[PDB]
Amino acid sequence: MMIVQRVVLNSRPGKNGNPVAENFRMEEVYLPDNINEGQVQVRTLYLSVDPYMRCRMNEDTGTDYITPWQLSQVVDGGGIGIIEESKHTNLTKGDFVTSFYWPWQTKVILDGNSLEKVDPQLVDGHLSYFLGAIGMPGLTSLIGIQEKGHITAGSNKTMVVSGAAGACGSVAGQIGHFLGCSRVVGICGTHEKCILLTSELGFDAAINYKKDNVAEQLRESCPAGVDVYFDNVGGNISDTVISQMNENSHIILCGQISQYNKDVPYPPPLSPAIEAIQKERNITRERFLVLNYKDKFEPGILQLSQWFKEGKLKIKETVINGLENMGAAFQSMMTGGNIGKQIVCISEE
Ligand SMILES: NC(=O)c1ccc[n+]([C@@H]2O[C@H](COP(=O)([O-])OP(=O)(O)OC[C@H]3O[C@@H](n4cnc5c(N)ncnc54)[C@H](OP(=O)(O)O)[C@@H]3O)[C@@H](O)[C@H]2O)c1
């Protein structure tokens, strides 16, 4: 058997704690030389780190749809890789495949049914985009705007995006334009991120929530009020944005990342005063889970790919190399180290 590398859950940061590299541990294991029927053996190419992973580090995730990682047991999540051998009928050597439950391990044997074959033509050979803008986060943004945004052509709505330079947010804000908003405004945590948004991703305006006065800034940037709020962050920023939303406007409730290191239910409730404004202005704020919309993934991916291949959709990702950097990359992502999608390159390939 060959010796490969592996990441396991070393320790829990606690429900109110910050996630650290050392919550994860590298190990070496043997990879069997034989596989069975229905199984395939894959070389891992890229792994995703994602904010929903935060809850899996707690003993309870607080939801059926997600189970907690176990200590000393290998961690798993979004991944893309290439088949090195298969005894699964629909899969053969050289196929590129993805899984939501890819073990953080350099080579791995999996059940052939848990995989889906991807077409590199969609991403122009840039496989990592399948875990970002042409994957789950891109779908979340496009489908979210579609199902919850209530943007019509012929309208000239203003959209605001929180977490606007992360995976979801960088994409959401371009889709906003594509779908006929007349104004898209971004809130992110760095000056460098604001530049990306206004100069590369074509956001009409960019605000830094750490160094700026968000409210004053939204007033200048959203002179007609906010009709759509694509919300990835929650907390105090969402409070500012909602205070300035128009009547019958819409919050796309994507994530609430500022709350992820706190012991509080999801989704958290608006404060009494902000809830009051929400009800008074007939603002919609419904829970959005992309996984409830599986049968729109096809068109979704086809659309995003199409926009990318037309030069319309701009894809940003931040790549770190090496399986022994998963922990560090998750920490970096949780604390705004990533521009666009945080991706880990597992292979010398
Ligand atoms: N509803 C669904 O089905 C679904 C599917 C995918 C993702 N999500 C949600 O979408 C959001 C973003 O996910 P993502 O994959 O696109 O990750 P990401 O945005 O690419 O990266 C996470 C970012 O959140 C920002 N952030 C972290 N802590 C913050 C705080 N306390 N206050 C304000 N901003 C903070 C950081 O950038 P800054 O420097 O800008 O602070 C960081 O880069 C999350 O809430 C996630 O859970 C929902």
Side-chain angles (χ1 to χ4, degrees), residues 1 3-14 16-33 35-39 41-64 66-72 74-115 117-120 122-212 214-215 217-219 221-263 265-278 280-315 317-319 321-347:
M1 299 179 163
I3 292 180
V4 301
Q5 296 71 51
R6 192 175 73 162
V7 188
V8 301
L9 187 71
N10 180 42
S11 81
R12 302 195 190 280
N16 290 291
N18 279 306
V20 290
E22 303 78 38
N23 291 138
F24 301 97
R25 172 173 87 242
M26 306 301 312
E27 286 180 344
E28 282 189 300
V29 283
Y30 278 111
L31 173 80
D33 290 304
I35 59 164
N36 298 355
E37 276 219 17
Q39 291 173 354
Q41 166 205 328
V42 185
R43 169 157 52 228
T44 303
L45 299 187
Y46 298 91
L47 298 173
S48 183
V49 296
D50 301 280
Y52 80 85
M53 288 179 196
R54 176 48 175 101
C55 74
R56 308 201 72 180
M57 301 170 89
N58 302 324
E59 279 190 85
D60 178 15
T61 53
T63 153
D64 261 312
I66 311 182
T67 71
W69 291 324
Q70 296 314 126
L71 258 37
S72 284
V74 71
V75 19
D76 70 323
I80 184 162
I82 177 164
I83 285 170
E84 282 180 318
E85 190 193 334
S86 69
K87 281 169 184 57
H88 194 275
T89 174
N90 307 121
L91 296 158
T92 55
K93 182 172 197 288
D95 293 336
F96 291 104
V97 286
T98 65
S99 179
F100 285 123
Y101 312 99
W102 203 287
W104 291 7
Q105 180 170 311
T106 57
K107 301 197 209 214
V108 64
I109 290 159
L110 303 165
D111 181 355
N113 298 292
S114 58
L115 296 175
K117 172 92 193 89
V118 291
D119 174 0
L122 299 177
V123 289
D124 271 343
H126 259 284
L127 304 169
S128 57
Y129 299 170
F130 280 132
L131 308 172
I134 321 288
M136 188 256 292
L139 291 161
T140 306
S141 300
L142 169 57
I143 287 168
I145 291 169
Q146 220 59 212
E147 292 303 310
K148 298 307 206 205
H150 287 82
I151 309 183
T152 316
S155 75
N156 303 266
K157 300 162 176 292
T158 290
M159 165 178 296
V160 168
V161 173
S162 57
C168 298
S170 57
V171 170
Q174 305 174 61
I175 297 179
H177 276 146
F178 302 166
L179 294 192
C181 285
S182 56
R183 193 157 184 87
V184 175
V185 165
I187 310 164
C188 42
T190 64
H191 294 307
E192 172 187 354
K193 277 164 195 198
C194 300
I195 302 207
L196 163 72
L197 298 172
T198 53
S199 82
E200 299 189 44
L201 307 190
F203 282 54
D204 295 290
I207 309 175
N208 176 348
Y209 70 89
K210 268 164 158 159
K211 252 75 105 71
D212 300 340
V214 180
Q217 288 270 74
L218 279 170
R219 282 190 273 274
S221 305
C222 306
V226 183
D227 302 291
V228 208
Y229 182 28
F230 196 94
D231 186 12
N232 290 308
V233 316
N236 288 315
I237 288 163
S238 285
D239 287 342
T240 308
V241 171
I242 297 167
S243 295
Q244 296 194 29
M245 291 182 69
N246 293 336
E247 211 93 2
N248 309 317
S249 55
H250 289 271
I251 301 158
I252 300 149
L253 187 50
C254 189
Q256 306 275 283
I257 209 165
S258 63
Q259 309 302 296
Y260 289 1
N261 305 327
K262 300 176 175 180
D263 192 340
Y266 186 94
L270 305 179
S271 76
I274 307 297
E275 207 217 316
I277 292 170
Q278 194 220 328
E280 295 301 317
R281 302 191 194 164
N282 187 50
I283 292 170
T284 299
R285 191 182 174 264
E286 291 167 2
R287 202 149 152 257
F288 176 65
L289 298 145
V290 64
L291 295 188
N292 285 338
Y293 302 88
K294 293 186 183 167
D295 65 346
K296 270 148 181 152
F297 291 14
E298 180 170 66
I301 292 302
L302 293 177
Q303 175 75 77
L304 290 156
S305 179
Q306 197 188 325
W307 281 331
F308 162 64
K309 293 167 92 52
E310 282 171 3
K312 275 198 209 169
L313 175 55
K314 301 290 167 209
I315 299 181
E317 63 177 348
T318 296
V319 168
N321 287 317
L323 186 75
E324 78 285 359
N325 279 323
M326 292 304 286
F330 180 73
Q331 192 180 342
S332 161
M333 188 268 316
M334 282 317 272
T335 64
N338 64 301
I339 289 90
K341 177 62 192 166
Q342 184 59 63
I343 285 292
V344 186
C345 181
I346 301 321
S347 226

